[PDB]
């Protein structure tokens, strides 16, 4: 005869399952390769726990996703050991400002840094923020793909990148789309890119470019993207869903995302284009990550 | 001096309580007879845990209530060993469609099935879904009470039951209220019922019957209920509260239910009629199912 | 080419429709017989407007329904000329306290009062409030049906009615259900009722009666209703829907009510009993009051 | 005295009363009607039909997405619909009951509708059958959208069998309708054989990966994989962007004006957007 | 596999399992207990009593504001309460039923409670009578808060008649209790005659402007007009500040450390804040 | 017999009342002296209407309150004629940034400007914003009381004021509390104030002052307020209520505010202090304004 209400009863059964499997699941944890906490409010305490339990392990973490986690500077510092384990680090939509950039800077300067992909989009970094970040990028050798989409850089921000870029020698992809920047800033950076030793791709769409500004960019092999007309197209939609995840019919949003995943698999299967396959597989990555979060 | 916030502090106290009592409550679990998880979102993982901890035990589970649990087909399959333990199985309000009917079908066909009462109301089963369900019912001997209220059947659905019914020989009560069906379907089913070897009671209220349709049914001993206006009266009332529980004022609803519970006790004590009593005992169980769930 | 947004555009079309039809609908207004404003927040200004436009007219207002209107004492005073036109006056769910009882008192004492049915349920009137109300009732001859369900009366309140009742000579029905009262208060009132020259029906269900308390009442022709378990059955059901109307799924509730309405029609047509019919006619009016309000 | 909103209401009345003659003229010369998102009750319906039932111009666009429209409201709104070149009725919970009214709209001698968008309504196969009869006797409609309308197997086979009865249809969207390999194939076949049909959408159905290739390999153009416009059309229906909206046209226009043989496909993908922008 | 929250739950379990011995020690030496805002069901109550029913230290503060506590929960929590120096129970919907349990808490030989905050509970005059009996046999409580507890006329007169039965009460808050001129005056009188009572709060009652002057003109200090601390105490109960919170102490501390004869009143007004800051 | 649902029926009666009283109320409007639209979303269209109907009239508008109106730069420009009528203008909590400051600048430079009190608090003006505003203040002679509480000024912002202040010769009260500014900025401004020809009162509380910074300020007759320990105390509470108005129990919040108003009246009546009376009367102003808004 049951004394515990439904949710309290389930909590209780969880505890027992978790108690009985403690030794087995402890081993499983030390061998994790992926860590998705997108959409959970990472308070100081949760931050502390994640660093304690996962601050060390056998393998690198192929991916660490903390999109939309309401992360602050302090949480960042606490999570440093976990980030040092990461190859891909997603920190989008976390409200990070210049304060947090000092901590990222140190993460990038750290001898143990093995981050190849860093996504900092949809955080109000600021020009001040990026300047600080740039210094970390100056002494880093691991990072090949960096995203700064919609991070409040503006003119000042992009000119700073343009001037400083060549101090990093391994960066391959930089995304600076949607940052309120005008014609000359955009051009200075486009110029720096083409002169860069490693930089293969630069995103400049959704900035405040005039139509003549665009042509100049277009006419200027580091590849400059000035218009949305491919995986990036997708990124920005899925940015919206990630935003509104909590706000929508979960069961519906799940099926939109399942069909889109299926849809992506096949388009990937049925072209032989290397760069097409790579672009789709990227979108597969973002979609799987939203499903998980549901 | 306290470092954790209120809910975080309570979690921590829970863990310690649970840790200290582990041996004692592990024993309590193994001799459970009732399982109410109504209103909790039963994700794959919760499904997995419940199957693991409660998949086996001493006694049958006199009742298993998972109304309003956002259960999918997969979670169903996971939960099959728990369902095989159940005498009474509530799965209302779970968004189950035709997909989930195959799993129910197999549950009903399983040699170990000892389910007597199966409530599937407020799930979009469909005519397709009930066709599949019917096949399971064909090879079942345990189920005596089946509820299909508001399951999307329509004319196609009820005509199907009418044609297939006599393939089951132990069914006593069938609720097909509120299913969008018209006069002839309802009449074909009412006909099949009266010729059925076991079927004692069929519910047809809240369908799309014409006033002449209803008299025909009325004039037609399997008893046919065509109008709500006792145990089913309140069933639909409570079914309604069941949708909206956490979704509106808790304390107020708690008191309404306590007073209603009390009104029913007294009503039951003041009748000698074995039938009336039994009808009322049903409703108290439902009130108690909601009280607990609060 | 459209400049206004959707709702703003609709407002503008409304104005023009209203402007064109001004003379015609002004006439329609002057011969209204019914006034349902249930669910709208009746502020001082809305109160003022309604009094101004409808303070006078040809006919009596067969019914005035202002349930759930967040009405205060002042708005009451404002609305007095409209209330003097009313045969039936619904003021449930308006948060009326003792303050508002003086205004009701005066309404009941007014020479032009022709209110027959006054429903004050779900307002925290209080024993103090009912004392004041009672004085009005003492000098009234129009009111035959009075509802005080869940108005905070308690023992003090019901004892008051018991002592004062016979001062009114035309009252036929009194609902004092769900008022927190105990066995003796309920018994004193039930006693006063049976000795009352006119009082045909007293409701006492959902009070804090003991099971022995209830039998006593039951064993005690003024009819005393001690248990819910027909017209009052649903009253409390609907009273519940009435709280939560816009607050939850509209289309679903619309359909439930349409089907219920329909179930009641048919039930009424299928009984010859003049009493049953009348009970059911009451409930349809209430269903229709909710339908309209949607 | 007047609280803020009530005071604003009162100012509106007076502004509206002083400008009555002037704005009455403006209305009769309206060419667009967007009521997307307002709950169109019987009364609101009645008012719209009264005030806008007739006018000088055709209504270049009529948008009533997400208006909680019922069959009755539909009948009331018919004289307004008859004025419409483009008619949006997405997300209105329209079922088979409403399809009779649509049927009669399509069959009406005055029908001037070129684009009809019925997506995200539970039409059903029963509903589309009835709709198809209207389409059979229509000559105005060139673009029809049936995205996520509960058609399934039965529904798409119906279209495949009945389509060639219409001779002016250019674009048919039947994406996201729960349909499998054969139904999708039947309809893809019918499309290629169709005298007018230039584009068929079949993405987000229940196709197998071999189903897809067959479709792909099969000039009516069949779209089987969303992966060149319909991207938000599927998801934009879930919220029902504050900058992103215009920035796709601001982006696709500055890209429409920098290309030959496929300068057209940029335009009708800009138009699927230019829709949702104001829509 | 594990979704984000479920994965976090699992990490928590493991962190909690590894640290069990260590944090068990930490708990037994807790001195503060704040559960403000969590719905304390029977089970949660039971757990708290089990794990924290006994310990080394007194609990310098126990805060359970806004916890949806009932009478039963109260009884369950008694052994925890007995450990408390300061006990907050505001906003818990406590009525006369609960007052018996409070009464017994106050009468208990082990009662060490100095500050008891019962505001924004519908105690009632019936409730306060019962509470008063407990207060009669209590010696620990120096600060009692009855702000907005439905006392009225009847309630305050009761206090006035019964007060002198307690001899250690220093501060009584009966603000915002719907009481009129005479009740307020009776109680103000009783206070001035009281052996210990240093401060009585009477603001936000139903006093007339002449009532106020009489009170004003009448050393137990009677506060009749909120216009030197209780400012948010009245409104802070409505939300139940992200910077404003600390900035009042950050402001009142840097003002507590720049003054003599009334350096004390800055402190106990800082303490009414220093409460709500963590509370 | 009624055809219109409750809210639609009330709309209809409003229209008729408003139609019948058109001539009378038209006259009333032209003689308005006060305009409170606090808390309504002032869209372009509403802005347009308010300027049309109230762009001119007989009297000055003793007060114009548009707190919490979601006003943009464009709405501001549209509302310019109404603002030119105003003696006191409240524009708090409107999200105004540097963009809007050009429009305020022009409002202050306008020959017809008769604004004495301008409240711009809780808008992210910025140092850039204030610089622009300062220029308008340089050519204004009407404004005696200016509030810039929490407008994102910081160090840069306050130093700008300090340097520019003496260009205005009639300013009496400046509020720059809660603007993230440090010791020297605060001191420079305090210094400028004491040297100012007219400035009687300067608020500097809730800035980032060190305790030694405070003493220096304190030790430094223009009156400098460095700590909250009076009407200003209140302002900032009522700032919170105004914020959360829509979010709270309106009936409750109304009674808190009624009792506080009563409370204020009396404390004003029962001290003879001129400056005390003026401070309370200010709080009376803010409270009455919230009540109205309810
Ligand atoms: Pt943005
Ligand atoms: Pt759907
Ligand atoms: Pt186990
Ligand atoms: Pt109640
Ligand atoms: Pt009139
Ligand atoms: Pt339904
Ligand atoms: Pt702030
Ligand atoms: Pt209250």
B50 has a chain A CB within 8 A of its CB? yes
Give the closest of A211, A215, A270 to D216, CB-based.
A270
Angstrom distance (rounded) from CA E124 to CA E151 = 5
Cβ–Cβ below 8 Å for E212 and F236: no
Angstrom distance (rounded) from CA F228 to CA E252 = 8
Cβ-proximal residues to A77 (8 Å cutoff; 6+ apart), any chain? A103
Q: Are F93 and F67 contacting, i.e. CB atoms less than 8 angstroms apart? A: yes
Residue B148, exposed/middle/buried by CB under 10 A (0-12, 13-18, 19+)? buried
- Beta pairing, strands A145-147 & A117-119: parallel
The CA C150 to ligand 4 mean position distance, Å, reads 6
Measured between alpha carbons, how far is residue F188 from residues D193, F107, F156, F164 in Å? 83, 28, 11, 11
Give the closest of C14, C29, C294 to F16, CB-based.
C29
The CA B58 to ligand 3 mean position distance, Å, reads 13
Cβ–Cβ below 8 Å for F5 and C294: yes
Tokens matching residue C183: 């066995």
Ligand nearest to the CA of F243: 7
What is the four-CA torsion angle of F236, F241, F243, F247, rounded to 10 degrees? Answer: 160
Closest residue in E to F207 (Cα) is: E247
F5 has a chain D CB within 8 A of its CB? yes
Rounded to the nearest angstrom, the gap between the alpha carbon of residue F2 and the centroid of all alpha carbons in its chain is: 46
Query: What angle, 0 to 180 degrees and rounded to 10, lies between the N-to-C axes of helices C98-109 and C126-138?
Result: 10
E261 has a chain A CB within 8 A of its CB? no
Residues of A within 8 A of D235 (CB-CB) are 237, 240-241, 256
D and F: number of Cβ contacts within 8 A: 47
Tokens matching residue C71: 């009405």
Q: What domains can be seen in chain C, in order of their start residue?
A: 33-247 (3.80.10.10)
CA atoms within 13 A on the CB side of E186: 17
The CA C68 to ligand 5 mean position distance, Å, reads 26
Tokens matching residue D48: 């719209």
Residues of A within 8 A of B95 (CB-CB) are 251
Residues of F within 8 A of D9 (CB-CB) are 14
Residue of E5, E7, E23 to mutate, testing the A interface (most A Cβ within 10 Å of its Cβ):
E7
Q: Are C18 and D46 contacting, i.e. CB atoms less than 8 angstroms apart? A: no
The CA A169 to ligand 3 mean position distance, Å, reads 56
Angstrom distance (rounded) from CA E179 to CA B29 = 54
Solved by what technique?
A: X-ray
Angstrom distance (rounded) from CA B102 to CA B85 = 19
A95 has a chain E CB within 8 A of its CB? no
Q: Are C43 and D6 contacting, i.e. CB atoms less than 8 angstroms apart? A: yes
C237 has a chain B CB within 8 A of its CB? yes
Cβ–Cβ below 8 Å for A206 and D255: no
Angstrom distance (rounded) from CA B76 to CA B82 = 10
Measured between alpha carbons, how far is residue A108 from residues A42, A80, A112, A172, E71 in Å? 22, 11, 9, 16, 57
Give the closest of F252, F269, F283 to E209, CB-based.
F269
Cβ–Cβ below 8 Å for B4 and A251: no
Helix H, strand E, coil C: the string for chain D is CCCHHHHHHHHHHHHHHHCHHHHHHHHHCCCEEECCCCCCCHHHHHHHHHHHCCCCCCECEEECCCCCCCHHHHHHHHHHHCCECEEECCCCCCCHHHHHHHHHHHHCCCCCCCEEECCCCCCCHHHHHHHHHHHHCCCCCCEEECCCCCCHHHHHHHHHHHHHHCCCCCEEECCCCCCCHHHHHHHHHHHHCCCCCCEEECCCCCCCHHHHHHHHHCCCEEECCCCCCCHHHHHCCCCCCCCHHHHHHHHHHHHHCCCCCCCHHHHHHHHHHHHHHHC
Tokens matching residue E187: 């109680």
Tokens matching residue C42: 């009746």
Angstrom distance (rounded) from CA F218 to CA F206 = 14
Residues of A within 8 A of E17 (CB-CB) are 19, 22
The shortest C-alpha distance from C7 to chain D (Å) reads 6
Cβ–Cβ below 8 Å for A16 and B29: yes
Angstrom distance (rounded) from CA D103 to CA D74 = 11
Per-residue DSSP letters for F121-171?
-SS--HHHHHHHHHHHHHT-SS--EEE-TTSS-HHHHHHHHHHHGGG-S--
Give the closest of F8, F52, F293 to D43, CB-based.
F8
Angstrom distance (rounded) from CA C144 to CA E93 = 38
The shortest C-alpha distance from A227 to chain E (Å) reads 34
Reported resolution, Å? 2.7
Closest residue in F to D1 (Cα) is: F292
D3 has a chain C CB within 8 A of its CB? yes
F15 has a chain C CB within 8 A of its CB? yes
The yes-or-no reply on D/E contact (3 CB pairs or more, < 8 Å) is no
Tokens matching residue C215: 């039998």
The CA E215 to ligand 1 mean position distance, Å, reads 58
Cβ–Cβ below 8 Å for B206 and C280: no
User: What are the phi and psi torsion angles at A206 (to 5°)?
Assistant: 60, 25
Nearest to E106 by CA among E126, E78, E127, E125: E78
Query: What angle, 0 to 180 degrees and rounded to 10, lies between the N-to-C axes of helices E152-162 and E181-192?
Result: 20
Per-residue DSSP letters for chain C?
---S-HHHHHHHHHHHHHHHTHHHHHHHHTT--EEE-TTS---HHHHHHHHHHHSS-SS-EEEEE-TT----HHHHHHTHHHHHTEEEEE--SS---HHHHHHHHHHHHSTT----EEE--SS--HHHHHHHHHHHHHT-SS--EEE-TTSS-HHHHHHHHHHHGGG-S---EEE--SS---HHHHHHHHHHHHH-SS--EEE-TTSS--HHHHHHHHH---EEE-----HHHHHHHHHHHHHHSTTS-HHHHHHHHHHHHHHHHHHHHT---HHHHHHHHHHHHHHHHHHHH-
Tokens matching residue E29: 């030496």
Q: Are D66 and D240 contacting, i.e. CB atoms less than 8 angstroms apart? A: yes
Which three-class secondary structure state does DSSP give residue B292? helix
A11 has a chain B CB within 8 A of its CB? yes
Cβ–Cβ below 8 Å for E244 and F240: yes
The CA D255 to ligand 1 mean position distance, Å, reads 23
Q: Are B238 and B287 contacting, i.e. CB atoms less than 8 angstroms apart? A: yes
DSSP conformational letter for B90: E
The CA B182 to ligand 8 mean position distance, Å, reads 53
A213 has a chain E CB within 8 A of its CB? no
Task: For chain B, list the contacting chains (3+ Cβ pairs, <8 Å).
Answer: A, C, E
Angstrom distance (rounded) from CA A95 to CA A86 = 21
């Amino acid at each position: 005869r049951q004394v515990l209400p439904p949710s309290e009863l389930l909590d209780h059964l969880f505890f027992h399952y978790e108690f009985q499997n403690q030794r087995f699941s402890a081993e499983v944890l030390s061998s994790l390769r992926q860590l998705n906490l997108a959409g959970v409010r990472m308070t100081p305490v949760k931050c502390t726990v994640v660093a304690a339990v996962l601050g060390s392990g056998r393998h690198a973490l192929d991916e660490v996703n903390l999109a939309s986690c309401q992360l602050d500077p302090a949480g960042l510092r606490t999570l440093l050991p976990v980030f040092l384990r990461a190859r891909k680090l997603g920190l989008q939509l976390n409200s990070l400002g210049p304060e947090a950039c000092k901590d990222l800077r140190d993460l990038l300067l750290h001898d143990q840094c093995q981050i190849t992909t860093l996504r900092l989009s949809n955080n109000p970094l600021t020009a001040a923020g990026v300047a600080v970040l740039m210094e970390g990028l100056a002494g880093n050798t691991s990072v090949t793909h960096l995203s700064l989409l919609h991070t409040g850089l503006g003119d000042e921000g992009l000119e700073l990148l343009a001037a400083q870029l060549d101090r990093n020698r391994q960066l391959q992809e930089l995304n600076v789309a949607y940052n309120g920047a005008g014609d000359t800033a955009a051009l200075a950076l486009a110029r720096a890119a083409r002169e860069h030793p490693s930089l293969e791709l630069l995103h400049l769409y959704f900035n405040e470019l005039s139509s003549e500004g665009r042509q100049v960019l277009r006419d200027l092999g580091a590849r400059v993207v000035v218009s949305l007309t491919v995986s990036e197209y997708w990124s920005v939609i899925l940015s919206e869903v990630q935003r509104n995840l909590n706000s929508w019919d979960r069961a519906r949003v799940q099926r939109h995302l399942e069909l889109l995943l299926r849809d992506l698999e096949d388009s990937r299967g049925a072209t032989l284009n290397p760069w097409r396959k790579a672009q789709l597989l990227r979108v597969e990555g973002e979609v799987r990550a939203l499903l998980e979060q549901l």
